[PDB]
Design a protein around this ligand. Structure first.
Ligand SMILES: CN1c2ccccc2[C@]23C[C@H]4[C@H]([C@@H]5C[C@H](O)N4[C@@H](C5)[C@H]12)[C@H]3O
Ligand SMILES: COc1ccc(C(=O)O)cc1
Length: 121
């Protein structure tokens, strides 16, 4: 769930989940539409897509167990859905870190109205 996703995002990137990634570009937080702004907005595009492969669970709400360990992130014996959600998030959190440089405060709190168009997963 978001409570787990947020801890992850903080743990890996050092930045707090909320202002730092909850409205970034066109796909972080909101989702919806548009051509992703940059590397970090693109992660969100994949993460959405990641949650999309699952219509059988509640990504935003179902709580899962994961632990850290000298660096990497480990998801644990859950309920398929629970496990699947964790790898989705795990990836996404890794992607943010992977691209912590292209992080631009210019896109932090990027509205919506300027986000235009289709994009198939
Ligand atoms: C409308 N809703 C949908 C309705 C029917 C099928 C798929 C979707 C969503 C789910 C998910 C994703 C982006 C980001 C956002 O989290 N959601 C929106 C747009 C779409 C997009 O795939
Ligand atoms: C992919 O990054 C996010 C960040 C915030 C939210 C949200 O606030 O719903 C969803 C996905």
């Amino acid at each position: 769930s978001l409570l787990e996703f947020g801890k992850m995002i903080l743990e890996e990137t050092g930045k707090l989940a909320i202002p730092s990634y909850s409205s970034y570009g066109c796909y972080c937080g909101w989702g919806g539409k548009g051509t992703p702004k940059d590397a970090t907005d693109r992660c969100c595009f994949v993460h959405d897509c990641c949650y999309g492969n699952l219509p059988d669970c509640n990504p935003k709400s179902d709580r899962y167990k994961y632990k850290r360990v000298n660096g990497a992130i480990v998801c644990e014996k859950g309920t398929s859905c629970e496990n699947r959600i964790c790898e989705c998030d795990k990836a996404a959190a890794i992607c943010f870190r992977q691209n912590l440089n292209t992080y631009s405060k210019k896109y932090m709190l990027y509205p919506d109205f300027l986000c235009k168009g289709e994009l198939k997963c």
